[PDB]
Every structure is written in C-alpha cells, then in structure tokens.
C-alpha cells in the first residue's frame, strides 16, 4: 500500500478583501516546508472548506502542489464532502492536478449509516489511484465511522490506507491498531499527538503546526524514531498552546494567533466564522508569549 505519513499541517486559508490571498498562501506553505514538515493538507476544516467556492477549493490544491515541487513534501489534498458525487469529483481533480493523496472527511449533517459510509468511501477510492485517508471527527459531522467500517474499507479497497482520528477516544485508537496493525493511524488532536504516536500512530495532521511547525515536526520525528522521552517532552511543553487554540471553534484561534505573530496580514474570516471575543483574543496573545514563533 502507498502511504502518506509523518508530520502534516492542516493549512489555514488567508483572505484579503474577501478573496483568497494566493501569494500569502504560497508563502505560508514554503514556511511549513522549511521547518521540517512532511506533508501539507489544503482546505480541510482548518482551511475553511465550508465557505470556499468549488473554484477556490480547487485553486488552493493547485497552489499547494506547485509550492511543493522540487521538495520531499507531499500534498494530501482535502477532498471531502457530505455528497458522494461531490467528493468523487474533488478526488478526481486532486489526482489529475498532481496531488499525492487525498483526505476525505466523513459526511456531515446528513448522518449516513455505516453501510452508507462504506459505499461512500468505496466510490471515492475507486475513482482514483492515489492514497485515500479517512477522516473521523464526530463532534463536527454528527456521525462516526466505526472501527469495523474503517477496517473493512482498509481491507477491501486498495487506496484506503488509514484514518485521521479527531474523536478524543484513545480506546478506539487501541481498538483500531490491535485488530488491524497494518493501518496508518494519524492524530487529528494536537493535545494528544504523543499518546497516539506512542501506541503506533504514524503521523499527525496538525493545527498547531501552522504556528509552530518546527516543534510539531520534531515531536513527530522523535516519536517515529522511538525516542519517546523527547517526543513526550515536546507534547507536554505544547499543551498550553494546544488547548488555547480551541478556546473557540477552530480555525478562529489559530488565525488569530497567526495574525498576532505577523504571519498573516489581516484577521479575516468568511461568515459564519468571525473574530474571537476580546477576552479570548487576549488569552491567545498571552499563551503565545511562552513559545518561540519562527518567522519566514
């Protein structure tokens, strides 16, 4: 099986005058590459998938692919949708425009059954010939991909090689790798990156790495080298910033932090996302003071 693992960043999407700032997007991706990141994920939840147009979603995949040329860094394109026909179209676009793989979030809002989830992902995997990583985040979608469904998809479909888990459920992470140890479990919760890696997870798809790419990369690579002491030391040091980046719904805090660090020009969202409360803005600024934030 082809795989995409290691330290990965769920990229924020910067706006200027309501438009995607395509030149700041490329600059932010190069900053990730230059700080030890193994792959980048354009247009996930962190990238404001919901409020981009279909053209804008596709444009950001192209920029990521272009920016990573000549490097070892891969593009795991965000291509999920709650409509199977939309998700297949995004999968085919990413394949035909040079992405190395795709991420595929579980359908949100319409709550498919486990059978429907299996048929949803089977259609996606049959549409392309590049790796497909499942993405489970029940707090946002309203549904859960069960362990049985995940494992069945891993064994029945060639391109499906693992799952990104954002469920705060370490028991399920043990369940997954105890019954299918060949799968690639990827952490989708920054605060518990180390516990997932220490149980055999093979990477992270990170919000914090937008701000601190070198620290997330070092944490992951320490763990992959079985230097558990050093990986845990970074995970413990990062807890305070990992928590404050979710005081409000992601990506509101991380964009606030990137703005306070001078890495994005303006603190701009697309509705229904908005600026954080003045209280939480001050809380984020205060937590940041304990970390050394790399520039460009």
């Amino acid at each position: 099986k082809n795989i995409i693992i290691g330290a990965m960043t769920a990229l924020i999407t910067p706006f200027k005058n309501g438009k995607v700032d395509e030149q700041s997007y490329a600059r932010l991706i190069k900053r990730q590459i230059e700080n030890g990141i193994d792959a980048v994920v354009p247009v996930g939840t962190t990238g404001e998938s919901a409020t981009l147009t279909n053209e804008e979603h596709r444009t950001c995949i192209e920029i990521a692919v272009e920016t990573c040329k000549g490097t070892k860094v891969k593009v795991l394109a965000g291509a999920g949708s709650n409509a199977t026909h939309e998700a297949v179209g995004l999968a085919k676009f990413a394949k035909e425009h040079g992405a190395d793989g795709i991420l595929s979030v579980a359908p949100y809002y319409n709550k498919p059954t486990q059978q429907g989830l299996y048929e949803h992902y089977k259609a996606i995997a049959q549409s392309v010939d590049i790796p497909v990583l499942l993405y489970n985040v029940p707090g946002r979608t309203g549904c859960e991909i069960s362990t049985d469904t995940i494992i069945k998809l891993f064994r029945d479909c060639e391109n499906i090689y693992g799952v990104k888990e954002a469920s705060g459920n370490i028991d399920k992470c043990v369940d997954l790798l105890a019954h299918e140890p060949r799968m690639m479990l990827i952490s989708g919760e920054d605060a518990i990156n180390y516990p997932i890696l220490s149980n055999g997870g093979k990477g992270v798809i990170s919000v914090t790495s937008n701000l601190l790419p070198d620290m997330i990369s070092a944490l992951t690579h320490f763990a992959l080298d079985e230097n558990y002491k050093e990986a845990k030391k970074i995970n413990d040091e990062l807890y305070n910033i990992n928590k404050i980046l979710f005081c409000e719904s992601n990506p509101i805090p991380i964009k606030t932090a990137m703005y306070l660090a001078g890495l994005i020009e303006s603190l701009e969202f697309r509705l229904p996302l908005c600026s954080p409360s003045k209280e939480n803005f001050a809380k984020i600024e205060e937590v940041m003071k304990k970390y050394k934030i790399k520039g460009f």
Copy 2:
C-alpha cells in the same frame, strides 16, 4: 438605523401544520412529476404549509440547480390554494444561504427556513451575524432551525431572542433538540415568538406549551393525522390532540430507527406513494431488519392514497 425593538412590530408568520417534503428520485434524477403529485396530496389532506428541500428532502446531495428547481415546483403547485411555501434555504456558508434566500424571495416563496450552519461550528456571535445577513437580504419571514445532533452547533436561547428583537423578518425557531426545558425558556422570556416543533414524537408537548405549529416528517405518510393533531391543539382541544399524538408514537419513533429520511422514504415506498426506494449516496436503503420493522408498524395506521 438598526434597533432592538422589533418584538411587537408586525411580523408576518407561517404557522400551523407543515410537511418537510421528501424528494423522490427516478434514475438518479429528481422525479419532478412525482414531486408535484406528492405536494398535491399534502394540500388535499389539511396541511397548511410545505417545506421543500430540507434535511428530509436531501438538500445535502442536491445540486444548486435541483435545490432551486424543487422550490419552484412547490411554489407553482400551491398557487390558488391556502397552502404556503416555507422554502428550505439553509447553508453552512453565509454567502450560500443569502443566495438561496434571495432566490426563494424572487421566485415566489412565502418564507424561508434556514438551518444553523453545520460542520464549521460558528460561535454565537457568528450565528448572529449569519442570520442577520440572511434576514437583511429579503423581506419575507425567516424561521430559524436548530438541530444540534446534525449540525454540531446550538443557537442559544439568548441568540434566538436577540435575533427576534433585532431583525424584522425573524419570527421564530424550529426546534429539533429533544429539550423541553429550552422550549419553556424560549416562550417564558419571549412569548411573542413562534415556536415550531421539529420533533414529531413530541409535537403535542411543544404545542401544549404555546408552540404554534409543526414541521413534520410523519405528515409525509399521514398528513391528515398530523394536520388534525395541530388544529385540535391550536383550538385548545388538548384532549383530542394528545389522543392523536399518543396514537402516532409508534410510527413517529420507527421513522428514526435509521437516519431520516431513510425510514420515511421506505414507508412512502411501502405505501405505493413513490415508484422507487432510491437515495443519493451517502444515503442508502435500510437494513433488512429495519425494513421489516417499518412495514410492520405501518399496518396499524390508515394511509391515504392519491
């Protein structure tokens, strides 16, 4: 200039017994001629309003063109009758929801339903700005829609009341949260709003506390019973309304043994009201066990034909 005193300024409303219409498919396309026939069946069985393309209508998997087409068919079919069209126009992107709202206005809908943004979990401030922009885009009634089990977010009682008091067109909320405490909270602090039940099994408890209508899944199958329940309740004949709500519990519950609208489409198919048990992925046929369970509950109810 904006202000905070819209509560008692005359708000156009859409209340009574309302149906969240299923969307029939034929060879993967919207069966536009079965859609019109089903809406006419609703009109002839005492329903006061219809809601095209909600969650029950598989809004998520329809294209933008198909979503707009189904609103047009509903508007056309209810012309010359007392039945209103409350167009489903929600989106998790504010610019999409504004575009749908303006479409519904410009093509003759009587009002709009607007679900709270799903998946991206906006803050209460974000929800306020989301709804504020939608309501300022049109001049027809806007009913908020709270269903946290599907969206991942909740519109607070405080936010709902602020929107009611700050914007002219927001006139109430459809609640699908299984939280009768919140329903008491809403009408005790803002009794001028229209609380609409979005949970069939508890239609009567919501109406008995001052709710003014239902937006029902069960009425797809049994429109006469849901309409009679509501009109009994609106006339304060609570004994007869409760008697029907009790009779419908078994079917109200079994219609969610799997995720709506999988059971209701199965039942409409078992009743001969649609030609195919067709969904758009990721939705699918129910399990064989749940199929039998649905068939088996239906037998105790009288289902009106065409």
Copy 3:
C-alpha cells in the same frame, strides 16, 4: 391502585450545630401543610440522604408522619438505597411507622442492569403493602430505568404505581403514558412541571416548593383541572427561580434560599456538601427578590 399524587415537596433537612434540627424540621413541614401541599417527601436527595445516619434518616420519617396526622397531607417516605437489603429495610420501617407510601431512587454508583433493577424493585414492593413510587434521575445515579422496565414493574407488582422522572426527556414521558396510560408520572424537574402535567402526569415532587409552596400548589391543581393557561402562566413565571435553584448542585441553592428568607437558622450542610460561592450566593438573593415568599 392506591396512589399518592398532587403537589409534593422534597423536604430540606436543617442542621443545627451538626445535628438535625428536629423542631425546625417540624416547623417547615407545617408551613408546607398550610400552603396547599398534598404530600411531603422526607430524606430524598434534597434532604441529604447520603450524609444522614440510618437513625437520623429514620427519625426524619417519624417527624413527617407525626406532623401530618389529622391533615389531608400524606407522607411519601424516602427509602432508596443502592443496596437492595438496605432499601428493603427502609421500606419496612416506613410501613411499620405510618408512612402512606415510599419513594425509592434507582441504585446509584453500582449501575445494575435492567434485570437487576427489576429484581431490586420487586423485592422492595413485596416487602410492604403500601404504594411504591420509582425515582429515575440518571445524572445522579449513573443508571437509567428503561421505559420497558418501568412498565413491566408497574404491571407485575401491585403496589408500584408510577415513577418520578428527573431526566429532562419529554419524549420518554410521552412514551411512558402512551404505552401504559394507567401509571402515575410525577415530575421531578421543576422547570418542566407544566409540560409533564399537561401530557397526563398527575403530580410533582418539587425543590422549589420548599421556598414557594403556594405557587407550586396552584400550578399543579390548575393543571390537574385542565386549566392549562393558568398553569402555564405560573410555570413561565417560575422559570428564573427554577433554574437558579440549580446554579450549584441541589440542595445547595435551595438551602441557601431558605436561609436568605429566614426560614432556617443557619446555612449548614454535611460534607462533602458545602456553602455556595460568594457570587452564586448573591445571584440567588437577587432572583428571590422577584417572588412573593410566604413566612411562617
């Protein structure tokens, strides 16, 4: 069946120098009788069941029985326990000492199965010949008595006549009375007293009635006569105090309010229960100013 319905009060237990103030207990119950209450419940959760000794628990049942002699008010003695042999002993004491019926909370902490709950209540009901009211409060016990178990118990044991529901689940209340309309459903959540009664419930067991017995009494009797408009008006007017009485864990706010109204001499709890925060103390006082509180 023989039943105990209507407006009922979950009595607070006052302490004086670390012992139960038995003369304040009697004075408080007499205040309930004179303000339209139909029954009183000694030693529930509100009465600090957990921290009373077995002798004090039994003494408090005795005081309630004595005080309601010669009146229309009944005593529904609190007799629950998470050990069946303890719950049987309390039930038999209540019977032998003149209680009109018993309330029996579902076993807490040890989480029995539905089969175990059935055997638990069957042994209790067979031990006495007075009415037994089940009590479901999953947020405190960790278990739920299923609708099926409640209906089975109602139909299989002669003296079990209903359930007190404190689960915030109006769907379950419709389920209960649609499938077994002969049972007595009793509200155990003050804020939704009117919605439960309007669906056919026949009474409440109230925390707020400790402070405002006349208002809860009028609400219940209005509703039982199908004067729903007048009952809803009181339920709506009581929402603010109904909510603030749970700003902290019951019975901390209600005992605070009774002290703030001068109805008890000292604001004393038994650890692990404690006085509320300074802020919540002031918040309860401010909500109270909007209500008419009867004295002695």
Copy 4:
C-alpha cells in the same frame, strides 16, 4: 511523599450462601501475590462496596492485610464514601489495621462542588498519616474531580500522592502530568492501560488482573522499564478480554469469568447486581478461551 504504585488488582469479593467467603478471599489474594502483582485493593467497586455491611467492608481489609504480611505486596484499602464522616471513619480503620494506604472514590450520587470535593479529601487526608490515592470515575459517581482540584490537593496535603483515573480521557491525563509531573497517575481503565503508562503513569488498578494477573503484571513492568514495544504488545493482545469484561456493568462479567475458570465456587452477587444475560454469558466464555488462565 510516600507512594504505592505498580500493578494492582481491584479484588472481587466472593460470596457463598449470602456471606463473604473469607477462605476463598485469602486464597485469591495468594494467587495475586504469586503472579507478580505489586499491591491489592480490597473493597472497591469491583469488590461490591455498595452492598457490603460496614463490618464486611472492614473484615476484607483485615484479610488482605493479613494475607500480604511478610510479603512485598502492599494493601491499598478501598475506603471511599459519598459521606465525609463515613470516609474518614473508613480511612482511620485502614490505618489502625495495617493498610499501607487508602483509595478514596469521589462522592457518588450527591454531586459535591469542586470546593466540596477539596474539603472532603482534605478531611480524609488529615485523619491519617498513610498515602491517599484519589479515584475519579464520573460514569459511576456523577461528579468529576477537575485537574485543578487534583493538583491543588496534591500540593496542599502531604498524604495525597496521585489519582486513579477511569474517565476515558487521555487529554486529561496529558493535562495532569504536564502541569504536575510529580504526581502518580494510575490507570483505572484496563483497555487503555498502556497509553496511560506510556505518558508517565506509574501503575494500574485492574479488573482484568483478577483473571490474568501475570499478563497485567507483565504489561505494567514492561512499561515502567520503558520497554514500550512489549507493553503495547500485551495491551493489544488483551483488548478483547478487556472489552468483554465490561459488556455488562463491572463486576458482573469478571465474577462470571472467575466462576467459569473454576477460581470461585459460585456465581452469586448481592442485589441489585445479578447474573448476566445468557448471550453475554456465552460471549465471556469465548473470549476467555483465547487466553491462558493460571490456576492456584
């Protein structure tokens, strides 16, 4: 601080004819000592604390103390209660009768505030001079000891040295040891024993070790010696039995399994606990067949 760490067993309490089988209890403890277990915990939830009399609870502490005398195995006596005066009395008994420390579950059913929890445990810790381990299990108690309260108690009272966590929340486990790495975090959920130990936890209090003391012992000692690969291997191999032992509420499955293994003479509980369902009886019987169960 004095501490009690390592691989520990939450002992089942066998009954025979409705009484505690005191000779089987001692025999079971000797089996634990002989399989590398570092300490035993009499009368927890697994020991049916709720349904034992005050005298039976105290007797089982005495049997554990006597059976482990002259050996290296410690006794961490279960002494919790939802009434502070009861918990202090149990704590003093354990001290006066030779226990090495005490475990003290957070108060169940009456839901104290964080301030009440602090005063509850401060009173317990001041009553004795032996180590005190807190016990958080919100699914059974209805309350949670916050990270702040645990750390404050650890820093303010000499005897309080850690917490047994049974909340399925690895984020909280990272939170605890990142802000107070000197405390002893003890796993209270068998399925995730290895992830908690891999983050710096120093022991387990196990249900599964009743049946497989050698395997739980080996898992813990592998982890404490930083052989993470071998500890994970055992944790992964134990997942199936760890899960089936909670198909129904603990200790119903574990007693069933001990009965099926011939380690106790009768499968009898005290109401409200009861035998499992017939299908669940068969399910436990299977999972056991994949494991090698040591005898006496």
